[PDB]
Amino acid sequence: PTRLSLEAMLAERAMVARQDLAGLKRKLAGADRVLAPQSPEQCGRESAQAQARSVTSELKSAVKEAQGLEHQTLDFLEQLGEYPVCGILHGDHPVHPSGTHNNNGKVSVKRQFAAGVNTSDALTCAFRFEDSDLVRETALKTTYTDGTWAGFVQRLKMQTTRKCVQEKVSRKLLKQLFPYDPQKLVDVSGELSELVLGIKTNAIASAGPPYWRTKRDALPDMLDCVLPLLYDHIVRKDLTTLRNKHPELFLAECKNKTDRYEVESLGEKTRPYFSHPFHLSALVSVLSQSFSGALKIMTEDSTSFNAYGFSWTNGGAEDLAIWARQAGEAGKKPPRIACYGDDTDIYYRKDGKLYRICPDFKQMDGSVDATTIEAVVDYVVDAHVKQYPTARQFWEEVGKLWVEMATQSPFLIDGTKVYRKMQKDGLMTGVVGTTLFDTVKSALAYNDWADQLMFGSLNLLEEKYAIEFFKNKHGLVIKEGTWKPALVNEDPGFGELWTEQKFLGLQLKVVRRENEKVYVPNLPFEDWLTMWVTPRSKYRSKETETMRERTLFDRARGLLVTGAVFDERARGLMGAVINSTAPEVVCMRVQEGGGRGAPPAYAFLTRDGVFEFPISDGYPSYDWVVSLYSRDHPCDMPRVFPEAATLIASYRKQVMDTRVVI
Amino acid sequence: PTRLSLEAMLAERAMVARQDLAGLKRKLAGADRVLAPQSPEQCGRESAQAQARSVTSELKSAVKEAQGLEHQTLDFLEQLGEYPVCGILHGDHPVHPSGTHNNNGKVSVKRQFAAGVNTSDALTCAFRFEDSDLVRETALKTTYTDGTWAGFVQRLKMQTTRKCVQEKVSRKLLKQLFPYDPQKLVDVSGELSELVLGIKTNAIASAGPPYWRTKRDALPDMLDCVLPLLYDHIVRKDLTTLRNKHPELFLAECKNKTDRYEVESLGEKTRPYFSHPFHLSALVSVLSQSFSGALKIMTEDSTSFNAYGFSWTNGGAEDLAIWARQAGEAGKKPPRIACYGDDTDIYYRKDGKLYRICPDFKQMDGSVDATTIEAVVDYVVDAHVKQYPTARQFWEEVGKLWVEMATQSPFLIDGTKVYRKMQKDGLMTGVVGTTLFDTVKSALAYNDWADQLMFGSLNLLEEKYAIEFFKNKHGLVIKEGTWKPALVNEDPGFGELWTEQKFLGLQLKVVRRENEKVYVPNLPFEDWLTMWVTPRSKYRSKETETMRERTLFDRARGLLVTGAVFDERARGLMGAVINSTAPEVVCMRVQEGGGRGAPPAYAFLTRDGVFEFPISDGYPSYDWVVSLYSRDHPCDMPRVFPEAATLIASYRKQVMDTRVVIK
Ligand SMILES: [Lu+3]
Ligand SMILES: [Lu+3]
Hints:
Bound molecules: lutetium (III) ion
Organism (chain B): Thosea asigna virus
Protein name (chain B): RNA-dependent RNA polymerase
Structural class of chain A: alpha+beta
Keywords (chain B): ATP-binding, Coiled coil, Metal-binding, Nucleotide-binding, Nucleotidyltransferase, RNA-directed RNA polymerase, Transferase
GO molecular function (chain B): ATP binding; metal ion binding; RNA-directed RNA polymerase activity
PDB class: transferase
Strand order of the largest sheet of chain A: 2-16-15-9-11
Largest sheet of chain A: 5 strands, mixed
Strand content of chain A: 5-15%
Largest interface: A-B, 65 and 65 residues
Oligomer: homodimer
Helix content of chain A: 25-40%
């Protein structure tokens, strides 16, 4: 009687079983568990939480004080009038949801500066498996918060009133610094709906005005209502009429970015970003995302300054080293320069010796000139149009909107007053293409820096003159103390570092796989600990104690994969967290990661950004994590409970050989 | 940002949308619907419902009375004692559940003859769109019931006490009549757990004793405890010890089969079958299923008598015709004989003209001799051992268990008394390989029938001498009136039939597609109508009104695919049901068919029985069904609501050309 195989029955049985924790607990009672390397227990649960709770209160006290500070006035921004709420309807309901973002018919919004900080669950784990003096110091240094009004306004002022230097950039120069594969460019000559449906974005992210919902809840309304309307006005050159009738259709929202902030500067620093209308962002994302997918990176073309698209896993970390060594003698041969937004990696040789530099830009978004922004939008639009000339007219018009969004969009801050930057200079952070805009601006400066080296200006290898140079000739602010070129260990031994410097937030280290060197990311334990005790997520009301224990497990796997596994103390910490996780929590059915578990928070592991754990009940072992960064990857992810898929099915392994003699 | 494409978001949005009937009805309020050809409404909703209940009540009354009849005694079966309940444990529970099949320590089981019949749902639809006199007359003829104590004991006695004729069969003849492909044989040389986990079965089916639960709920106990225990006593040749300590591990249960039955013969016909212990049936299923997966069929090898594995779709119906035409002159050239269980199709030529014969056996299981059973088991075991000799002894030991289960396997009927068939002859229906055993028995007989035609015995073409032949030489009972050779239409025109005869329960018919001929299955409206108004499912109170209405939709698609679409009246009745189905029910999310919808009941559409609909919200059109039975590229299944996927996600696509000139 055929229907469903026995193996399928067991599988179907297990899937049902791991949805019942209480039952899952009994099924894994005496199950052979594989413990991961962990740190020894330092104190009990009670003390660990009490100490962790004490730190959190002291952090809220600091945040509370800073948030009480008076903030500067917004008289540095052009003040437009008040915008009326969009009366557009999508059949039965209005595109602008009634009862939200409305003040007597005028569009409104309210900035959120909460006192709440973190969950402190991860902090309890730290106090439990590490020295307290070290844990408390690290925890009190940084915190996850909404920031402060004072820091928000001050930071907004800085990136909207800075004197910029217009760049001398041409298509010839951009084709040289940022080469791409025309064949990888998306066919923009196709129908618009298909193109837009192809762009990727965060479903939870705000749709901006006039939707005031998630991009998921507002997707339909913008797709067969707002988009069509926008399109018809674009082709008829009648954008101005649509702007006057529905001002909110082009309104942006200036927001304070909740993030990890230094506690001793919460009152003078809170990064602002701009959230544009879904239909505008999604439309340009057709070009922006198309172009990034065609862009060659530093390790694919040694003439390219582009690091935007670089990833560590799959030999990627080794690629950096192999490419970095191509650096020539300062003054005689060209250096190696990789640009990834505000982040940059510089290599040069002095007397044959390889040196590395990892400078920081002090809020370079306020240094991005309109000439560079507009020259990039042209480079992108011209690239597509040069490939599919049948649609030149339309996308050139889109480039105009793209430039407006990046520099001169009207936005709300707090309340009902609408604002706008006095000057076109300065990049409005958050706009589609922010990473590219920063990269090109950064690359053009360093490309100039390289040219000066050839004249023999080897004094530009020094912080003093470097800082002076980037400020006068490019208007970029190199943070003092970040220009410290270090001698590079070109052939690291087992366990040795490339340099103690960072790129994309990580160090380059060499480890032993099996008689072979593997290049992998690494960080000091203090840095791993800082990220751990400072999860980017505030206390949610309905997050049960179970889903909370699972978050520790998933965050622990993530950090290990990012490189925490290559540090002793950090490895042990995540190891202690994983081993202290209940069996039913390790083998439960999770939703994140397509059921395979939430992926690492780090965004530069794979170029497509998509990292997926093999199984949800597996722990990151040293041999498995190394295989992610090696060019081979001949390794499966080990299970915390070997022989668990059977136990969940209420049966156990048993070999019954049919070859036996009777 | 970048988490997932917008196209993906609409997909997720569409997924949750098809899980809310209220919202789903709302979105599909004024959507465009492609209506299937239907019969006009014959009478109102209340009137159709009134006539339906009245009929089902008659059928209940008929079944209730038939169940009150007295049945014969079980004196014809060997009288064994009582078996003790198996007190084997798994950890937190015993293999034999507490307070279930137990009577003061002794194994027990009660036979179920309830007076529940049908549901009246499909029948109400029939009265609504069809002739009252026809629907009434058709529905009153048969019902889906448990049967009766009388017909159950009668049919059991007949198949357990018939005088059989031992077949002269050898491995040589079996290779000649049943050729297979050694490469397609499962490597039973490596491990048992992996092999046993390879066999497929019904999860809702009883695991038998001592589990007394569904195979799904007893699987863990069977695999992790009982099976390993059985293995040890097999390798040590100590099965006689395990029998005398845990008799229930070898005990079977004789059950009455709930099914469609003729009402006027409820007291005479209720087919019995045997359900062996899970660990046994699964163990032998390894060899059985492996062999049928490697078996050649008539249309793949002319010398083969095998029809076990034949399917209709994908040119199957035309394959049968192309194979049948090869039949030679009776006496001179060999005929064309295909055997599938007790069902058999025969073709021969008399003065050039082709004739077809579709005879019926009377409970063939009672006629299956023990020698044929042994010969078949040895044939299957030898085939696997010839391929993988490194495990010969083990599976040969299994062949011993296989033969036992098919003949001398002890069993319970009702109460607590253990019975057994006194003779090794007669096949215990239900045993793994029942289809194969019947097929081989039928082939050995017809193969001999074929040889007699060569000896000049052309009188065996006549029913009078055919019946006498199968009886005297093979103990096979040909049901009188079923041996009636019909002149075959070798090249049927558009809309014409192969013959009015049935094979595998369907007729062979030729239909038109543009200009080419297509061979497809077919039945009279009366036969489609009988299957429709007689669903093989009893009334279940824990089944909502939405579930019932969805089932009408599914069964309507299933019959159309099976061939109801090629009958004008049947096509119209099924179309009426589909069109009368609520949009929220059509585009609803279903669980059956892996989310694609419940597959057709007919299990001879494809070789592996699995027919999967492309979509759950589509309807079987004439064009789509025909492409299923043809050999080339089945068309896309037409959606009931062509604008469905869009309207669900609250989306309406609008062409925006990027290649447009700007003002
Ligand atoms: Lu200390
Ligand atoms: Lu009439």
